[PDB]
Amino acid sequence: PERRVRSTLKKVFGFDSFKTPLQESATMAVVKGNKDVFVCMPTGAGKSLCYQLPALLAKGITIVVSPLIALIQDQVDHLLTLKVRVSSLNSKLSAQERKELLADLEREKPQTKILYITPEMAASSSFQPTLNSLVSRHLLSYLVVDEAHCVSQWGHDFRPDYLRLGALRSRLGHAPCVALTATATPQVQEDVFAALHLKKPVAIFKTPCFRANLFYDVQFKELISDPYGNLKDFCLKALGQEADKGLSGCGIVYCRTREACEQLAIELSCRGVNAKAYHAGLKASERTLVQNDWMEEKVPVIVATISFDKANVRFVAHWNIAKSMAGYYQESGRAGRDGKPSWCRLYYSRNDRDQVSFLIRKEVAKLQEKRGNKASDKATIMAFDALVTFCEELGCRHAAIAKYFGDALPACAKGCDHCQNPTAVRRRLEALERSS
Ligand SMILES: [Zn+2]
């Protein structure tokens, strides 16, 4: 019941109301138990609560399998801080403590409401008697697979144990299963659905990556005579939306190369807008100084490399195409963190695209040399291809981002490069074709 889950959420996690409505629906679906559940919510979006609360309110016990020992310990400690009866069965646990946890499990009603487990030892022969004892007694109310993307090779991070967890789902079938992930491409979604042996009916419960307060546009460097002047104008316009407000908030600028990024920062400083460079090339003390300046209002817009949060960000500009489409989305997510509208820009270049594709080729060659994973090797270049295709698409850029993440394509009434003055973006694309 809705009232029961509401009261349980307030009593356990001290949460008066769910942070998101979609996560509330996901929690309803999981506690219902009629069908398996999937969730793709970004870190810090309450994805944990979706699987924690049903376990709290479940008549049995919920097994939560997570790839890292540290992650398991962090979740268990977080729930213990909430006075929740949780256990952590892992190799890190001692023999006596492990036996005590097993004794707790063997009780008629297991003392540990939520049992976290590391997948590698979950396949261990020692755990299997406990696992099938749990299965026979029908005490396993739910199963949870955190970091579900690890099962898919196409995912950024992969775990073969997560391929095995299809077997664990085959076991304990009576218990509904909840797969959880931070970001999941539709390829990743299908890999998770087929590998974990999840039930035929599943609710994806993925938060729409689209944010109404975002403005995605991809200007062409070759099209603009002085792209640095264009970035100066974009920074000036985005820093202030209210004439009385004037310059406010702060933006971010991303660089493909650390060394050229310092030159970029100094020449934007001379442009009239003060900025600082953040990259490995810069000394650590200076890196911290520029980070602090960005966190404060001292620097209107900061300049950083591809590698790195603020309460409110005015804009996130990408002087060069990001290494991966998901990487570009993550970097642009910093923009529009607050409710105030924010603008995200990407400065394409055919030469820059060739350079980035060469970098991706070197990366995939290194993967083949060491990783030896053809699927992920093709996945990286597929992400780069998706980013570029998003770049040269005479369509809603939010729609393309949603397609890459697989969520239903948003429709931007306004505030999107294509959704307003689309013909202008198409003319820019035609000029790009004319140039190359
Ligand atoms: Zn749009």
Author numbering: 12 to 319, 324 to 451
Paper text:
Here, we show that a generic and kinetically biased ‘Gembody’ (Gb) interface, previously discovered through trapping in crystallo, can also be trapped in solution by kinetically controlled side-chain-to-side-chain bond formation in a manner that leads to ready generation of complexes; these display ideally balanced interface flexibility and yet relative complex constraints, in turn allowing rapid cryo-EM structure determination, even of small targets.
Because of minor flexibility within the DiGb interface, imposition of strict C2 symmetry prevents refinement to high-resolution signals. Current cryo-EM structure determination methods typically struggle with targets below 50 kDa, contrasting with our ready solution of the structure of 49 kDa RECQL5. Further validating these methods, all of the structures obtained were largely consistent with deposited structures, with the only changes being small interdomain movements observed in RECQL5 and its slightly different Gb conformations.
